[PDB]
Each structure stands twice: as structure tokens, then as C-alpha cells.
Amino acid sequence: MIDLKQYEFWFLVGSQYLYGLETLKKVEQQASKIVDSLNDDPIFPSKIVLKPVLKSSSEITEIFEKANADPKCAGVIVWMHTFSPSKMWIRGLSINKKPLLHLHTQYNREIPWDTIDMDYMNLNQSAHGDREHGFIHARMRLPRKVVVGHWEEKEVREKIAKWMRVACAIQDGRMGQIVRFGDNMREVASTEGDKVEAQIKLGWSINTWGVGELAERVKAVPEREVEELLKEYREKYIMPEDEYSLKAIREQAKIEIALREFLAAANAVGFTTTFEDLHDLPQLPGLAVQRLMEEGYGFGAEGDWKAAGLVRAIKVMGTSLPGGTSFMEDYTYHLTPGNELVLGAHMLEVCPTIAKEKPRIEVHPLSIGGKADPARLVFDGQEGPAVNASIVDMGNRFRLVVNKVLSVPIERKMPKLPTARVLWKPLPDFKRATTAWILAGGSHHTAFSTAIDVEYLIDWAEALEIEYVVIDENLDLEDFKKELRWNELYWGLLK
Amino acid sequence: MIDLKQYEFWFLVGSQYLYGLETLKKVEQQASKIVDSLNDDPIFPSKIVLKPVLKSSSEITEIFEKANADPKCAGVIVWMHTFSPSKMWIRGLSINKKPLLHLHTQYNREIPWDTIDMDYMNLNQSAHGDREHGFIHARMRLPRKVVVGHWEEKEVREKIAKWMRVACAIQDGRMGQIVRFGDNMREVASTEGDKVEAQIKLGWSINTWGVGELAERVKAVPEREVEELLKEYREKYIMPEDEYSLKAIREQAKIEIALREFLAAANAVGFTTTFEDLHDLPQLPGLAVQRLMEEGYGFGAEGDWKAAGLVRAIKVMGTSLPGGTSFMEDYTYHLTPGNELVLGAHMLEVCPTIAKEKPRIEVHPLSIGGKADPARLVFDGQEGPAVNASIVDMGNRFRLVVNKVLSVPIERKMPKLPTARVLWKPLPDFKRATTAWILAGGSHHTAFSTAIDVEYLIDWAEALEIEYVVIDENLDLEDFKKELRWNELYWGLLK
Amino acid sequence: MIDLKQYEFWFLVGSQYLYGLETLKKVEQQASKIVDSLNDDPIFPSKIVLKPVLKSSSEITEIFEKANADPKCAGVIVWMHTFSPSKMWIRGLSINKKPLLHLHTQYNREIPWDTIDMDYMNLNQSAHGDREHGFIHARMRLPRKVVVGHWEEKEVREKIAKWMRVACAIQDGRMGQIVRFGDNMREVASTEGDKVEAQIKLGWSINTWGVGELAERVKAVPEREVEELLKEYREKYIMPEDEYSLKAIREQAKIEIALREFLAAANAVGFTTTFEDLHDLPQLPGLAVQRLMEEGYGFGAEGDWKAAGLVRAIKVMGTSLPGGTSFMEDYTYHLTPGNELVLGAHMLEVCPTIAKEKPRIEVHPLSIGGKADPARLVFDGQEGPAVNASIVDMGNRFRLVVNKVLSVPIERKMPKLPTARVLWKPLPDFKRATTAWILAGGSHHTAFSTAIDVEYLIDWAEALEIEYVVIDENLDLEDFKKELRWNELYWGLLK
Ligand SMILES: [Mn+2]
Ligand SMILES: [Mn+2]
Ligand SMILES: [Mn+2]
Numbered sequence A, B, C: 001m002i003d004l005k006q007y008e009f010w011f012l013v014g015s016q017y018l019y020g021l022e023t024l025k026k027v028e029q030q031a032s033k034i035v036d037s038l039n040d041d042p043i044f045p046s047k048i049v050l051k052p053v054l055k056s057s058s059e060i061t062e063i064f065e066k067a068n069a070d071p072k073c074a075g076v077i078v079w080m081h082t083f084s085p086s087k088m089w090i091r092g093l094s095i096n097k098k099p100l101l102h103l104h105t106q107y108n109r110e111i112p113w114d115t116i117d118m119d120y121m122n123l124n125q126s127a128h129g130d131r132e133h134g135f136i137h138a139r140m141r142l143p144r145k146v147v148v149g150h151w152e153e154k155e156v157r158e159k160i161a162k163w164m165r166v167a168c169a170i171q172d173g174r175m176g177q178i179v180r181f182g183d184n185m186r187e188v189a190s191t192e193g194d195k196v197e198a199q200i201k202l203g204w205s206i207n208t209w210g211v212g213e214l215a216e217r218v219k220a221v222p223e224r225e226v227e228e229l230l231k232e233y234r235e236k237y238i239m240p241e242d243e244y245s246l247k248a249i250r251e252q253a254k255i256e257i258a259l260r261e262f263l264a265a266a267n268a269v270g271f272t273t274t275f276e277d278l279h280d281l282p283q284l285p286g287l288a289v290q291r292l293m294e295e296g297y298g299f300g301a302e303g304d305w306k307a308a309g310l311v312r313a314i315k316v317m318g319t320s321l322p323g324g325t326s327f328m329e330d331y332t333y334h335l336t337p338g339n340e341l342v343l344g345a346h347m348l349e350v351c352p353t354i355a356k357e358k359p360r361i362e363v364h365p366l367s368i369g370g371k372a373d374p375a376r377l378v379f380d381g382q383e384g385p386a387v388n389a390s391i392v393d394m395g396n397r398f399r400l401v402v403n404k405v406l407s408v409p410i411e412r413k414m415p416k417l418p419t420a421r422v423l424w425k426p427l428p429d430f431k432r433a434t435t436a437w438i439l440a441g442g443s444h445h446t447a448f449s450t451a452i453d454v455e456y457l458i459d460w461a462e463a464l465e466i467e468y469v470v471i472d473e474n475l476d477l478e479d480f481k482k483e484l485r486w487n488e489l490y491w492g493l494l495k
């Protein structure tokens, strides 16, 4: 299980040397009083680390040097308790690459109306303290998330925690590696992209291996390791009796063991396969992909590493109780006028986290790629609102298209449909949302997620400086059309 | 053994309907008198086709539509015999994608000083005829090659023939397809690129197949086919006797037959392999690659499809008597002050077209990629001037770096060097040319060619509208730096 | 007396994990053999530090992270001994801000013609090793200096040592701070600039203090410190006898002690004054400024902090045997047709490092700013070639104009001219060079230097990514005109 907990966020308080050493300790004590009570709230998925109050420029750059060196650091929260002049922060901000969150707050809620004096205004320079700081950010063209509100309020705490999840989701991508077993499906364009621009912009390291490398590991698996997987399969899934149905289960278990060993040996965070190139593999890898995705490993099919990396990062985001992130492909539509829906599924690989029922193992005739009927997990989709994202390469840059959707319970049964399925409504209308998905050039391979909001992906794209286009409920098609071309030039030369 | 005499070039003469029908037939007859004598000259590698003199705009667009419809047409040569207004050419030029050559010429060399009358100035309106025509090209931002001179002169004929060779080299790339057996070498950047923008800009269709697909073909080869290859090997090459050296020759022969069968079935023009992904292949492809390159198939190693496609197109260019094009890798330097050279070779694959002596088959221990000692062709390089080109992906666009070099004869013999090799001097100085190659970001995999001049690649880049940077003798390093940065923005927004 | 020696340069050797651990030790030992012999050469003004050969991406980023943290590191020298794939370097190059020098070299000069085998070719993969590396720089648009040649040759060593001096000149500016005593001269434009954009681009921290701050320190100077300065003055300079001339010497001595106390307390590297705002100061700072400039402190007059910072960095460059850097103001011309010259001087402040004769203390009536006759050093200019540079603010960016000049000996003496003076010829012609200086918008305050070449400032501007325009002998006025407009948009949008 790869779940975030080790990542820490560096809370940063600012001051200057042109102050008395007595009032600085009051700021240090108050900052401890804020960050410790912040750690008392269980909403934050990671710890906070208060660092000594900064007064000179050299201290600023010294702390930022340590922020980029420690891999356990995945973000910095900056808050000006008092007036800290910004020209001290220039050299420090010109070196850091960790995401920034600008917390605008004052520790005391109300104003002591009868006791506000000049010795208190000198301490609580909150209003005009970071306004000068935000100028230096807007000036340096630096990407950051701004959040305003009193730290005791819940709304600001939710915003800063969502930013924490995103600020570490990019880190599980700068460190990790994406593995390709076979190249892209031939003549497919949306799955292709510039592998170097991903390392330069997103940080996603990406490499390709021949599938025979996997075929070496799938056969060299011990026999008493697949039975410990079969007892787990029985405790959670499994089809009737010992027939040819269980032969595919043992084959999928042997592939699962090979994949876990391989991805562990090469520090992987996501992987992708191809269905027309898996020789010496006795069967198309199914169920094992769902087993690896159930932990956290992102996956894309047909060579699509775009979707694999997006699914991995967006799975690092949605990691808590309302979890549910899967690799999706919009498969078919339901064109009734009043209740037009869309049924999403794949040929085999759908993550069992968005499942509503008991994940049921099934095997069915599947001639795609020409092997033996592979196993798969079957379940109905989850209810409620969700998001459907897709990153696609635009030649000179990447763009992230995201559609907010409302998933609905399945009304009718499907006896002959072998793969797990979800039904949802694209907001606002199927016609508008789908014609906007087509205008933006969104790929067919998407990242379905019920655990996160559009706020998450918006902070992801803001932190990585890539184009984002959202398809909210207030979607006006013509204004979205203008938005596409106005964005096309901003991200082209500037970034 | 695919050659290029089938391609034809469409000669296009311009006039207008606002003229007498009598002098238009004089223009038609004069154009026939020029084009027939043009076909009589054997310097041109392809035929010319005179099409009826154009007078109206609809005729213009009709001819250009047939130019985009006929696959045998690979270029259009435009010449204004009389004043043809350009606004008729606007709709015709706004639809064609075939390369344009602007022939500026007068059918008669001298001026009839004693017989120049108004019926002759009205006929031979060449001087101010295409001056108006070139304006609509500069205006429409249309790429074309401009050539001025009398068609009887040899210099102009050399220029137009080089343009013909390039204009058919691009067609063997818009139609053909490049095949990849395995992806790129892991973590390598200069060999990687955007496969979609390559189809959009250059037209090179590109796809990837698993190496097991080739391992299927290598084993089902008939037996009486390998000895028919060994007799041809003996007629030209071959190593002593059957011990362990003749086994690898038959292994390479069955690989050659498998590659021929595969590449012919999928309309291929170039192919690329990888040394760390050759599962079920008993031996690294060597001699067979050189055998295919000797005919015309372009090749790149370690997944480099950039070099493979460039080698294929530049082999289509250099196709006649002074032939000599190979896939090269700058392997090692010779740093003596007065006679500093560079030794280029590969691990196995060097085309036997640049060979000077008899290609000698040799087998030597080669542990790269972990297979059985493969066979290879050994020979010394050719003398005289040559060029060394490389196309590389710059994120938003491709750029073509080309170095003019002077090859020198090999002074000493190399008993322990197993691969064929070439020695050359980069113009003007090794320091200047190599530091400019590094500034421009040229790949290590290059396309060495002795059959063509820099004019060829310059018309290639002019016709495809990609950045080209030359390393001529007139190389001033600081101006080259400024050239790189000034070019980065013209090809950035405009194209 | 602040010079350089503490700065260290990190030599960086590249390889990959996909190699045998035995042949990696050969590279480590060979790199030690190169860097130790490099430290044996006294041409290099700073030390070299070999760091373990890098094989994985994480080691790359670890080294670059520590390079930005250690303040003693002022540059990184990169050299690919073997083929190191570039995608490993992406995360490492995307974090460092230290200047890069790309050393292209092979440890052995000639080629072992009779002993070149695959076990030697696998070791010295230098030729095609860093070509792949330079591609990742061209791709990431990262600024760097490329140097090609064998490390035993002296010319390449001269290039790399000049880059070392420049790479540490920028560090004494990212850390240091510039002090202003009074603002700019009123209504003057060329001295003005954006104090924030200087910290963002050049790193120069800049702040202003009232002149009364200096007037407090000038009066509380101990008495037995100024006579201890007068004895040294006698050892080097001094005017006849104790009269009104020595009163100004004691005034300059107390000003010098006050400046020494002030600038050291606030980590200063340059300072600037103004002549129309010196309240409570009994005398305009003269001789004391020359005494501080003789050590290393940069200085600009009339509030010009551009010239002060430029003089400081350009003094850090020219610090060894051929020393000689001063603050200059193009003061008057000599308009004879064949020998048109320009006489450069100021009202008081000319550095005694460019002096040819014995610096003679003199006092003369000077009504500028309304104080008491200040002291000054008088001497004739130096011979040989020199450069005259000037950085100027262009609204959105800075540009660096530099004029190559040839200094000439003074033919006649000037009895009534009170300030030290230099005579030189602007290359190629005074008309061309001065009309190009006016076209480029060069300020009247310049940085005259005899210790450095144009190569130094060209690497300064290349490392800081600012526009540079040179006025060498190869000055073509029309080409310079086009160069200005082509640079304006490249440095306007891109950087
Ligand atoms: Mn699919
Ligand atoms: Mn290679
Ligand atoms: Mn691209």
C-alpha cells in the first residue's frame, strides 16, 4: 500500500532584522500556537513543520535550499505575520521548485476594540504584511495557490488540505517512474506524446521495455505463491468451481506476482501495457492490473502513458475514506431524450475502488489480441458526483480537459456484458459536454475519479503551469470556444 | 530495390485570356520546344510533363487539384512566359501541397537588336511576368525554390535537377511508412520525438511492432533460400571456412529474408531496431541491415526513427553515380593539433555504399545486448567532400543540423577494430564545428552522405518549412549563436 | 581587500547504472587524473572538486541540489566520459541555477590505431556521449558555455579559466548588497532602473540610505588612525608640505574610515554617492573612493548603481596580474581626422589600478556640489587594448553594450587638468563606434577595464541571459542596426 504520510509541509513565517528581538519571540510562540493546533485537526493528510522565523534574505534562500533537497518535503506554506519586505524573498523564490500555498490569516479572530494600541499594530501587521509579499509573487510570475481566511474556520482548512494532497501528488511523479510494456497502439494519436516534455514539465520519468521481459518473470513464479493469492481471491471474489475458469485465475495470479516484482525492482508508480504485443504471455493481463490499481498503481491501456500518469497522481490525491479512482474509457451512450447517459467501461481493466457490489471474478470469450479468455472483475459503479479528466499532448504543450459528471445507479441488468461498468450524466447536457470534450480534443482514455473535486485538478494544473479547461455546470459553449483560442497563445510562448 | 524514375514533374506556363489566341499557340509551341530539349538532358532524374497554357483562374485550380490527386506527380515548375495576373493563381496555390520551383527564364538568350518590335515584347513578357508572380508567393507565405537563368545554361539545370531529387525525396516519406522493432533505448532523449507532429509536418508515417513479431518470421524461412544468399555473399564478400563463422552468415541470411518479407508487406521505406530488446532472436541484426541499406531502405539504431527517416530520404536524394549514403555515429576523435580528425563508425550497421574497398564479412565478439557474435561488413571510408546531417525534435518543432565535412583516406590499418569506419575533417575547424553542433543540439546518430551537397538538404528544409542550420566553411561562431536564437521565434509562431 | 580563491568548481562526470562496476572505476580514476593535472596549472584562479561519477537520475539531482546549497560553489563543469542518457539529467538540470560549462574532451589525444577494440570503444564514448547531453540543453533552453578541445591543450584551458572567473563574478552579486548614499541625480534617466528586476535577473540586492548616516560616522573617527593613513599616503603619493592641501587629506581619511566601517557592516560589494546631496559632509568624497575602489569595491557616481554593480563584478573578473578596472565617464573628444580619440576621466573618482605613473595627490578648486577642495589622484592612462562596458535598463529588460578600444600613450602633458585621464581609440572608428553606442542607448557612465577581454562580458551576459551587443572591429553599422531589432523581441518574449 503506497499511501502518503511521510510527506511534510514547511510552514514559513517572515519578519526582518529591523525589529526588536523581544517581539520576534512573540511571533515564534504564536506561530507554534497556530501550527500545533493545525496538527490537531485530522483533515490534513500530512504533517506540518514550523521553521525558525526568517529575518534576512540569506535565511530565506537557506531555507528554500533545504526545501528542494529533502524528498520528504512536498510543499511550503508561506504566511506573513508581520511586514516582511519582499526584496529579501527574491533570491529565495528564484531557486525553489516546491509548490507554494500563500496563507493569508491573522491568529486572533476579532479586534480588541478597547485595547488596540501601537504596540499591538506593530505585532499584528497581518493585513498589509503579505500584500507586499503577494506583489513579489505576481511580479516574479511564480505559480502558487492563494487561500484567505482565519485558520480556525473549516473552509480555509479544507482548501489548504486539498492543496496539500495535490502538492504531494506531483511529487509522486517527480520521483517515480512509469513503465511501458510495449509501445502505443499503431496509428493512434491521442495516446502518443513527447516523452521528454513530460519529464521537463510534469517530472514524469517514462521508459519502455519489451514484453518478453515480463514473459521471463511470469513463468519463473513459484507455485506456493499463487495459492496464497487464490485463498485471498476466495475470501473476496472467485467464480463457481474448479474448471477452466480457475486456470485463468492461476495465470492471472502468476502475472500479478511477476508485475509486483518487476515494478518494485524499477521504482515504479504507474505502468501501461498493449494488447497487440504480448508474446509468450499466455493471456492478456487482466485482473492483476485491477489488483495493482487497487493498491495505488496507475494504469493505462493501449500504451497510453498520459492516462497512466494522470491516474497515478489523481489516485495519490483521492486517498482517504471517500476513495475511488479508476482508468476509464467512455464506451457507449444512452440517447433517450430526458435521461441520456453514458456507460463507461473497458475490455478488462477497471479499478475495484469505484465498485459498489462485491467484486466478482468472471471470464468470458475475448478474442482481442488473440489469447485465452482472461479473467476480470465485474461490479457496478458508484453513485453521486464525480470527475472525468484527461491530459493530452498539443505538440508544444500539454492540456488537461476535465468534465464534472453525476454518476447514477444502474437501473437495468446486463447478462451478456462481461466487464464492470459505470453510468453517468455529463454536466450540463450530454450534447454540450461531449461537443466541448471533442472541441478541446480530449482523449478517449480518461481518469475517472469519485474521491476528488475539480478544485484538486485546478490546483494541479496551476502548480505545474499547464493549460486546464473545465466543463462545469455553468458551461456556455461559445465562451468555452473563445477560451480555447485565448489559452492557445498564453501557454505557447509564456508559461 | 526501389528507384525513382516513375515520378514526373509538371511544367506550368502562365498567360491570360485577355490575349489573342494566335500568340498563345506561339507560347505553347515555345514551351514544347523547351520541355522536349529538357527531357533530352540525362542530368534530370525524372521526366517533365508540359500541361496546357493557363489563362483563367479555374484552369489554375484545376491543374493544382490534379497535382494533389496524381500520386506520380512530385513537383510543379511554374514559369510566366507572358504577363499572367497573380490573382488568378491565388485559389490554385491555396490548395496544392506539392513542392514548387519558380523557373525564371527567357526562351531566347540574346535580344534581336534589329528586329525587336511590339509583337515581340508582347510575346516575351518574361522579365516583368514572373516578377508579379513571385509577389503572390511572398504574400501568401508559400514555400518555394526560385531559380533564374536561361534553360540552355548548365548551372541552372544543376539547380533544378537537385530540386527535383529533393522534391521526390519528400514523396518517399509522405506515402511510405517507417517500422520500429522495439521502442527507443531507455532514458535516451535525442532519439525520441513526437510521432504525430512528424506525420503532420514531414508526412512520415511511423509505427511500432514487438520484436517477437520478427522472431516469428525468422524461423519459418525455407532452407533452399539461405544458400542462394550464401552464393551471392561469396560472389562479393565471405570469411574463410565453415567453423563458427559460417553459422552466423546463415542466421543473418534468414533474418534478411524475414526482414524483406516483413517490410514489403507494410509499404515500408525505413526501419529501426534496438539492441536491448531482441527476445527469441538468436543474434543481433547486423549484416542483414547493411544488405537492406545497400539497396535503399533507411535504418536507425537504438530506436532512432529520426535518423532512419532522414537516411531514407537522403538516400532517395543521392541515388545516381556518385552515390554513398550511410547511417553514422561519431564514435571517437583524433586530437592531434595539425591534423585533427574524427573516426565515425557504429557497432555493426554501416552501409556498404560509402565503401572504398571490397566489403569483407567478419565476425567478432560483441557482448552488446547479450546475443551471439553477429556478422558484419568491414571496409574503409570514401574520399572527397561529404555532409553529415541530423534532424532533431525541439519540443514545438524539428530542426535540421548539417555539417559539411571533408573525408580523408585512412592512413593506418586497424586489426582490432571490427566495424567499418570513416575518417573526416569537420569544416572549418573541429573545435568550431563541434561546439556549434553541440550548441545546435545535434543528435549523435547522424546520416552521412557523400552523394549530395548542402544545397539538397537546404531545399529539403525550405520545402518542408523547418529550421535548418549549416556548418559551412564560412562559420562564425557568435553569428551562429545569434542565428539559433533569432530562428527560435520565427519558426515558433510562424511556420 | 576582497579577492577570490574561496570559490570552488564542481567537475561532473556522467555514466549510467547499465554498466559494469569495474569499468566505472576506470572512469573515476581517469577523471581524477584529469582534474588533478588541471589543478596543477596555475592559470585557473579557483579550485576544482571531482564528485563521484553519476549513473542514476537521483544522484544527478542530489549533486545539483547540493550545488545550490553550498555558497562556495560558483559553477559546474559537465563532461560525459561515456554515453550517459540525457533523460536522467532532466530533473537535475531543472533545479540548478549555477552557471554551466560543458567541457567536450577526450582524455587521450591520439587514437591507438593498432589497439582500438570494443573494450576501449566502450570506455571512451566521449564523442557521441555529450552530443546527446548537449541536446538536452538545447531542448530545455538552458544557458551554458560549450568548450571543445583536449584538456592538455592550453587554448581550451584559457577558455575554461575565463569562464571560471565570470562564473564567480556573478556570485559576488547574488549574495552581496549595494549601498546608495542618496538617490539618483534629478531628471537623469540612464542611471535609473528597476531595483526589483535587478534582484530577479542579476541578483543584485540594492538599497538606499540617507547621507546623514555617513555624516554621523565621518566625525567620530579616532585621531591616531588618520596619521597612520598619512604615512602610507607618503609611501605612495602626497603633495609638497603641510598646508591647506593636507587638511583635505585628513578630511578624506576620516571619510575613508567611515566608509570602511559602514560598507563592511552591511555586507556590501559596491556603493554609490551623489554630488548634489552631501549635507553635513564637509567635502565631496574623492580620494577615499579611489582608495576603496583600489581594493575591489565597485563605485558609481550621480546615483548610478548600474555602473557600481558592473564595476564590482568586472573588477572581480580582472583580479590577477593584468589588473586594471575603473569607473569611467566619456568626458571629451579629439576630432582630428586621422587620429580621432576620446579623453576619459571624471570629476574626481578614477581608479588608480589603470594608472601608468605614480598616483599623485592633488587638490584643486572644485565648485561641483559646493564643498571644500577635495583630494584626488592624478596619473596618465595605461597602454594596450581595453574594453568599455555599460549595462542599461530597457524597461522590460537590461542590455549590455560593450566597446572594444585601443588605449594610446598620452602625447602631451596637461598642467591645468586636475583629474587623472586616459586616451583611447574606439574600434574600429570613433564615428562608427560612437554612433553605435548611441544607437544601442549606452549610458554615459561606463566601466573601463584593461584586465579583461570581450569574451569575459560575453560569458557574463550569456550566463545571466541578457542581451549583449559588441562594438568590435567587425562592426558593420547596418548589421548592428538589424541586430538591435532582432534581439529586442527574442529577449522581450523569451529569456
Ligand atoms: Mn481503450
Ligand atoms: Mn549508439
Ligand atoms: Mn512536441
Ligand SMILES: [Mn+2]
Pocket: C302, C329
Ligand atoms: Mn556625470
